[PDB]
Amino acid sequence: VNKTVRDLMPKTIMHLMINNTKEFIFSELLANLYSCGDQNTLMEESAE
Amino acid sequence: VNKTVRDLMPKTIMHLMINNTKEFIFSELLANLYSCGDQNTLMEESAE
Amino acid sequence: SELISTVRQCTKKLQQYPRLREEMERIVTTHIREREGRTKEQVMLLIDIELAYMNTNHEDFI
Amino acid sequence: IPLVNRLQDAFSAIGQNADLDLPQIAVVGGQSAGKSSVLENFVGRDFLPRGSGIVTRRPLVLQLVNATTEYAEFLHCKGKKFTDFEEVRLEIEAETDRVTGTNKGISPVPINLRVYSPHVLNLTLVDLPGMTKVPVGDQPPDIEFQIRDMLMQFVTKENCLILAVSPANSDLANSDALKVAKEVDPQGQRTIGVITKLDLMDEGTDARDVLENKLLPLRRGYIGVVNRSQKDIDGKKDITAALAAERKFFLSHPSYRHLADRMGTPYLQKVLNQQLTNHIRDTLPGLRNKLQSQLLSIEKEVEEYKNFRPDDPARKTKALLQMVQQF
Ligand SMILES: Nc1nc2c(ncn2[C@@H]2O[C@H](COP(=O)(O)OP(=O)(O)CP(=O)(O)O)[C@@H](O)[C@H]2O)c(=O)[nH]1
Numbered sequence: 149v150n151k152t153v154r155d156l157m158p159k160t161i162m163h164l165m166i167n168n169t170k171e172f173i174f175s176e177l178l179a180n181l182y183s184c185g186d187q188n189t190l191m192e193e194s195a196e
Numbered sequence: 197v198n199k200t201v202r203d204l205m206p207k208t209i210m211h212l213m214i215n216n217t218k219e220f221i222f223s224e225l226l227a228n229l230y231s232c233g234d235q236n237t238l239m240e241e242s243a244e
Numbered sequence: 245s246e247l248i249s250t251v252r253q254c255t256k257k258l259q260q261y262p263r264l265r266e267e268m269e270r271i272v273t274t275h276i277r278e279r280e281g282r283t284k285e286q287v288m289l290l291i292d293i294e295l296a297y298m299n300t301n302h303e304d305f306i
Numbered sequence: 307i308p309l310v311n312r313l314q315d316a317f318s319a320i321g322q323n324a325d326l327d328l329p330q331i332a333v334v335g336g337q338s339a340g341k342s343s344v345l346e347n348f349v350g351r352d353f354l355p356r357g358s359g360i361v362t363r364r365p366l367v368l369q370l371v372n373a374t375t376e377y378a379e380f381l382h383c384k385g386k387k388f389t390d391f392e393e394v395r396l397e398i399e400a401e402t403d404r405v406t407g408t409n410k411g412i413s414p415v416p417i418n419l420r421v422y423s424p425h426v427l428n429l430t431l432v433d434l435p436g437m438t439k440v441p442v443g444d445q446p447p448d449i450e451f452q453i454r455d456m457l458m459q460f461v462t463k464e465n466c467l468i469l470a471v472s473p474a475n476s477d478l479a480n481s482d483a484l485k486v487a488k489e490v491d492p493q494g495q496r497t498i499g500v501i502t503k504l505d506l507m508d509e510g511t512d513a514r515d516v517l518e519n520k521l522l523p524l525r526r527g528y529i530g531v532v533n534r535s536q537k538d539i540d541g542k543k544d545i546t547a548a549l550a551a552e553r554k555f556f557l558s559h560p561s562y563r564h565l566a567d568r569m570g571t572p573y574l575q576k577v578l579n580q581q582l583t584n585h586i587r588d589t590l591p592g593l594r595n596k597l598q599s600q601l602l603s604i605e606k607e608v609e610e611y612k613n614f615r616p617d618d619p620a621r622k623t624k625a626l627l628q629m630v631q632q633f
């Protein structure tokens with residue numbers, strides 16, 4: 149049981165979290181990034 | 197991967213199907229049977 | 245705790261912009277903390293499956 | 307009322323040992339800037355030592371918490387429940403004197419105080435002594451470094467919002483608050499600037515260039531407040547008429563009326579509320595699930611409990627039958 153939990157617990161987290169937040173970064177980040185905030189008073193130049 | 201799917205197909209079926217229908221029988225069947233209408237006709241005396 | 249810091253590591257240095265290293269981090273981190281619930285649920289349900297049959301036909305010696 | 311306050315009220319109601327995990331707030335500035343006055347006006351109730359000279363001479367770690375009705379407790383008068391704020395202030399100053407002395411000495415040992423209120427967050431306010439360079443009275447010759455690192459040990463930690471208090475009397479370039487603010491928070495992402503004493507500016511001068519965030523551009527902007535003068539403090543002026551006078555001054559001054567809406571203490575309270583709202587999230591999906599599972603663990607019995615009427619034969623007999631079967 150220890151072997152079959154060690155061989156399987158990385159897979160479940162990395163199918164539900166890694167390969168899903170990565171897909172979200174590919175295909176949805178801009179869509180909601182446009183929506184959050186003003187979309188106009190965003191990406192304002194830092195004083196530097 | 198055949199070993200790991202062969203060891204977790206039974207467990208997957210039963211933890212969801214059998215070891216849950218068993219608890220349904222032992223816990224919830226009585227409530228449904230008593231709550232369904234027309235108690236007088238739920239128990240029909242058979243002619244025999 | 246490690247991935248959410250790696251996101252910060254890859255947003256702090258590319259983004260000179262203010263508030264665009266903030267909205268980006270906020271959105272990505274909220275998505276990650278939304279996924280942590282699902283993955284914890286799946287891990288718990290994997291354990292609850294491994295408490296169901298206790299096979300012996302496998303390569304344990306009888 | 308703010309939704310973060312309502313959420314905290316609901317959290318207190320459920321009573322589970324959960325918290326929104328807000329960042330702490332530290333108010334810092336130069337000596338006689340107005341730090342304690344701004345802090346008490348943000349709290350809403352007058353319970354802080356405020357006077358000319360050195361007054362806030364010991365780090366006061368306030369904890370505003372939520373409960374049914376209001377009182378205050380220290381960590382030395384254990385069991386006692388201070389209720390009237392004149393007594394609270396007198397106890398505060400006596401506690402400061404009992405270790406610092408009565409010759410303007412200071413002590414870095416924090417005074418841990420807790421206040422209860424019906425509609426406040428589980429905040430963590432930190433009032434600190436102002437920054438001085440030349441020792442006065444019996445202070446050690448390194449009083450500057452002492453105050454500096456003493457407040458640095460509280461500010462340099464993360465999740466510590468900074469209230470950089472500066473008077474409108476001295477030119478902004480001298481601000482001991484802004485020096486530390488830009489030293490510990492370079493990008494200015496957890497720093498908020500407040501300009502006090504706007505009624506004490508020289509004839510013909512105005513703080514327009516700094517309140518429009520042009521003279522020293524800071525990301526979060528500068529909020530202008532006008533507290534109660536020392537004469538008003540001695541005359542026991544009340545918060546409501548003080549705020550009315552501040553509003554009148556902002557509407558009457560030709561150089562600020564175009565920003566009167568964005569100036570004032572209530573705006574500062576609103577801005578702190580906005581920052582706390584933006585900081586409580588990034589954990590809600592974890593917390594929403596954390597108590598969603600809690601709701602799951604009881605929804606089953608809630609089914610029996612929503613519609614219970616005494617003498618119901620159906621429920622009574624069903625319960626009897628299941629009890630007998632499990633027996
Ligand atoms: N007219 C006027 N007086 C103000 C204003 N703000 C503060 N004061 C006065 O500053 C004096 C000290 O106020 P206080 O907030 O206690 O300063 P402090 O920061 O505690 C002094 P330290 O931090 O060094 O211990 C008081 O007399 C107060 O009336 C203001 O906006 N207008």
Ligand SMILES: [Mg+2]
Nearest residue numbers: 342361362436
């Ligand atoms: Mg003070």
